[PDB]
């Protein structure tokens, strides 16, 4: 453990101290107005060149192995150290996020949305980073979206038209995390007849439902960033 304890100290100096300063009290870690920097998050969780991946490659190559897009401990010749279970769980969560949202070396994923219908709804208008999907109860088509998309004013919004009232705002969420903030407000359930599908439902005013089907290109797609909610990077690698 003297070598293991000096590695725990290297882990906090090289990774955790910086991670905490950069992301504590920011969205998606906390449900607040302040936003985590997407380019800075990429610097930490890039699969190969990220600060976390570099520390694991440089300090843990022996006892910790990459198995696809996963980090797996060595069961044979543990030096004979015991990993902090919260550390393995943390790096596995981050690897899953990186695998879905940071494959290009920067933040960026694609997903599709298919608009649904509901009683009392005439129109829905979903906008994310200047990509608009307007639906008026016609034959539903899958629309492809990018997140983050290139724009000077990032954000997401959702409005709707009622049979009784006119056009109403459901929510308007500015910033680079706009889409994630919007998705967090939806009632979500894994749709087992569509791959990789989730039914999304925003509860608008007067009991009106704003329904969509989300199809991801891999895993949970943009929903994976919700795993950062209350996420804590552990202060130790080993117990």
């Amino acid at each position: 453990t003297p070598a293991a304890e000096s590695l725990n100290a290297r882990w906090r100096t090289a990774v955790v101290d910086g991670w905490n300063n950069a992301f504590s009290g920011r969205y998606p870690f906390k449900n607040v107005s302040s936003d985590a920097s997407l380019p800075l998050l990429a610097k930490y969780l890039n699969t190969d060149t990220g600060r976390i991946a570099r520390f694991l490659q440089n300090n843990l190559s022996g006892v910790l192995h990459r198995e696809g897009s996963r980090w797996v401990p060595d069961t044979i010749n543990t030096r004979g150290l015991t990993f902090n279970p919260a550390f393995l769980k943390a790096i596995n969560t981050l690897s899953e996020i990186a695998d879905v949202a940071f494959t290009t070396g920067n933040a960026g994923l694609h997903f599709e949305l298919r608009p649904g219908t509901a009683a009392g709804v005439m129109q829905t208008t979903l906008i994310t980073d200047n990509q608009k999907l307007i639906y008026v109860n016609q034959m539903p088509v899958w629309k492809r979206f990018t997140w983050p998309a290139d724009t000077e004013a990032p954000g997401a919004s959702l409005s709707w038209v009622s049979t009784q009232a006119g056009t109403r705002q459901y929510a308007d969420l500015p910033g680079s995390w706009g889409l994630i903030r919007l998705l967090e407000m939806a009632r979500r359930k894994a749709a087992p007849g569509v791959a990789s599908g989730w039914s999304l439902s925003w509860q608008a005013q007067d009991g009106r439902m704003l329904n969509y089907t989300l199809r991801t290109e891999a895993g949970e797609g943009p929903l994976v960033l919700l795993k950062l909610r209350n996420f804590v990077l552990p202060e130790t690698v080993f117990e």
Binding site: T117, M122, N137, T163
Partner: protein, 123 residues
């Protein structure tokens, strides 16, 4: 004929979803030079030089909308197509075509929306 008179009437159960819930629907009215391009085009093509004018009306369940628009001289035909959720594409009951001869000068032609169909009520 100078003006185009159309009345679009909807029954209580129109544009029914899977759950049998009635929904409002958008009806598009086309002022065409000929009916070949319109007829040959399917739902997908139509809703993404024959087009002189285009008009969109919103039809609420159990509702009605009156179309009174200037008939432009080149308009040999009028196309009425409804942007239904699940239209019957084999039957082609989601749209109607009417030639200028089918039009009355002061009186509107009755287009009835019921379920997933548009029916032109005989004069």
């Amino acid at each position: 004929i100078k003006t185009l008179h159309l009345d679009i009437r909807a029954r209580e159960a129109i544009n029914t979803s899977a759950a049998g819930i009635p929904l409002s629907v958008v009806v598009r009215i086309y002022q065409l030079k000929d009916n070949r391009s319109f007829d040959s085009a399917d739902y997908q093509a139509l809703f993404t030089g024959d087009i002189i004018a285009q008009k969109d009306v919103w039809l609420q369940p159990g509702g009605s909308v009156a179309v009174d628009m200037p008939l432009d001289d080149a308009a040999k035909f009028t196309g009425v197509a409804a942007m239904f959720l699940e239209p019957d594409q084999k039957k082609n009951t989601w749209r109607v075509v009417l030639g200028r001869d089918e039009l009355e000068p002061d009186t509107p032609r009755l287009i009835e929306v019921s379920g997933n169909t548009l029916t032109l009520l005989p004069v």
